């Protein structure tokens, strides 16, 4: 992509989209680690 072709507001929309994508994957891994504690812990309760 030749990003030099876009304007400030446009380009800004892209940074926003990449951030919206980042937060949605940083929270996708948190939901992964918080579903893992709830299983390691429930397993400790079986010991």
């Amino acid at each position: 992509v030749e990003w030099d072709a876009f304007s400030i507001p446009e380009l800004q929309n892209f940074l926003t989209i990449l951030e919206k994508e980042e937060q949605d994957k940083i929270q996708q891994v948190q939901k992964k680690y918080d579903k893992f504690r709830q299983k390691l812990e429930e397993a400790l309760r079986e010991s």
Binding site: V1, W3, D4, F6, S7, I8, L11, Q12, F14, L15, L18, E19, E21, E22, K25, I26, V29, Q30, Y33, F36, R37, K39, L40, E41, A43, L44, S47
Partner: protein, 350 residues
Amino acid sequence: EDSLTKQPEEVFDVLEKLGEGSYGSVFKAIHKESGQVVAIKQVPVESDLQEIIKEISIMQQCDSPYVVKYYGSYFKNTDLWIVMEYCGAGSVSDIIRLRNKTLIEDEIATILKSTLKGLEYLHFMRKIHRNIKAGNILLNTEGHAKLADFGVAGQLTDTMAKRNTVIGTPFWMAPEVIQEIGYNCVADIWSLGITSIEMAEGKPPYADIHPMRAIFMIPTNPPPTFRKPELWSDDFTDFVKKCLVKNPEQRATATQLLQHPFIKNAKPVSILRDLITEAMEIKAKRHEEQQRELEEEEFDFLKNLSLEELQMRLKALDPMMEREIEELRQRYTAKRQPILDAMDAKKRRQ
């Protein structure tokens, strides 16, 4: 039939994982009752049940020592369990991959001798494999080659999914398949011919070339040979020539290729014993070597885990997150680096 009504885990003790492809994971297992080792594949039902079952119905109606035997099925937790014959040594493609070495003639002849037996068996029943290649020829722990992962009738003109995935890899296709958009028994012989070169050189002719370009070459150019034909015998060389015959009416049948010297003078399956042990041994060395690595630098493993190795992972769980999401923050600073460098310029111009 009574063992089919029982639940899977209660009939077989599933052991180590063996690998995967594009439709699920393959596993090793042991029949608790007779001790006969079997294989068990696990596919997600949600993803096109019709396509999986069609292959199942084709393999189950096959009964040959040269065709991988299918035993039955079960249903368990959104996963359809397929019990298959256990070919421990993996596929010819995997063995060549594992050892990092091509196959010697004698090795090739033996493998081809049984592969041909399978083709003859199939063709005699007026069936077609439609998809012969090294990756679909499986060797068991003893050295017995078997045909697997069959193609299915009409896999070329079936809309888009399979009317496009086969197109992407046409290196084993016979010329008349490209021009007729269909298959004849002798098509498999051509594929076998290419597979012969695949075993000696490690990859088929035109493999490294763009498909679209191959699709045009195969029916146009003269049949391929060895990149170094002096390293191979005259029996071997000639046999290949007889398979790679562009005219499907002048292409030797499976029944006839069994009469060719290269094959008729083939060694017993015991010569594979040595190349098989190395492959399986390396397969084990990688297994243990890799299991000790994933255990160091760190709904079944938890049931099979100890109390103290379960309590210490939970404690070392957070440290794994600061390194997991700090990498994500570095990846997206890279993705936005251009956009910011561009905005930099535009903020300098106005």
